[PDB]
């Protein structure tokens, strides 16, 4: 199997915000054009 | 050095070929979905470790704590000492293996946060200007972000199964081919904004 080693451990912020796509908007912007 | 799509033997495969004594690589977790792993070499031998993804840090169940994969790998690349077995052995993380890149085009960035995607765009970019990194917060997957006094939209790709699909909405066999799609068919937002990828934000030095 795969050797997953036994390890002897234990011895302000700003970030970006993501966005989700609308497939209704696109879908009619997109059949917006070929029309 | 993160290896999207490889397995423990073939992450061992790859150091007894391409590398050498204290090269390493990153790899999702095959025993474990969601979690990590990182494979060493050392004494021209391989040793797996487990990478704990709790959704809020990671860690190697134990010691210290990270909020990012990469903040974790980094932080023993530069502390060798800190990995120890229970037997006392050191594992040193030195030479990164680098994987293939997804597309070659230049506007892909790679590692690339989103504080310096919106830096690089905000003081070299245009409307419309966009690029392609990878996701911090999502290892394996990749960001899009746009220019829309200036903000970037940041959208997140989604890779499964070696696909790539945009909130889902088409398959495409490569980044090429759906950063293809989007230039010819925007997406929008939920606010409503229209992304349109007017001019690519290339990269610099090749």
């Not at chain 2, 494979?39 to 797996?48: E, I, K, L, Y």
């Amino acid at each position: 199997q795969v050797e997953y080693l036994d390890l002897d451990l234990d011895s302000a912020d700003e970030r970006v915000d993501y966005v989700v796509v609308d497939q209704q908007k696109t879908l009619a912007l997109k059949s917006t054009r070929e029309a | 050095w993160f290896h999207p799509n490889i397995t423990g033997v073939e992450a061992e495969n790859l150091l007894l070929t391409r590398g050498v004594d204290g090269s390493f690589l990153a790899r999702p977790s095959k025993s474990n979905p969601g979690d990590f792993t990182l494979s060493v070499r050392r004494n021209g031998a391989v040793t797996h470790i487990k990478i704990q993804n709790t959704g809020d840090y990671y860690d190697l169940y134990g010691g210290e704590k990270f909020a990012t994969l990469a903040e974790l790998v980094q932080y023993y690349m530069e502390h060798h000492g800190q990995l120890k077995e229970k037997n006392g052995d050191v594992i040193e993380l030195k030479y990164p293996l680098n994987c293939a890149d997804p597309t070659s085009e230049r506007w892909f960035h790679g590692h690339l946060s989103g504080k310096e995607a919106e830096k690089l765009l905000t003081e070299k970019g245009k409307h419309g200007s966009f690029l392609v990194r990878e996701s911090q917060s999502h290892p394996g997957d990749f960001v899009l972000s746009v220019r829309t006094k200036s903000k970037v939209t940041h959208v997140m790709i989604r890779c499964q199964e070696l696909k790539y699909d945009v909130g889902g909405g088409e398959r495409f066999d490569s980044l090429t081919d759906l950063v293809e799609h989007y230039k010819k068919n925007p997406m929008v937002e939920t606010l409503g904004t229209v992304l349109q990828l007017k001019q690519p934000l290339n990269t610099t030095r090749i």
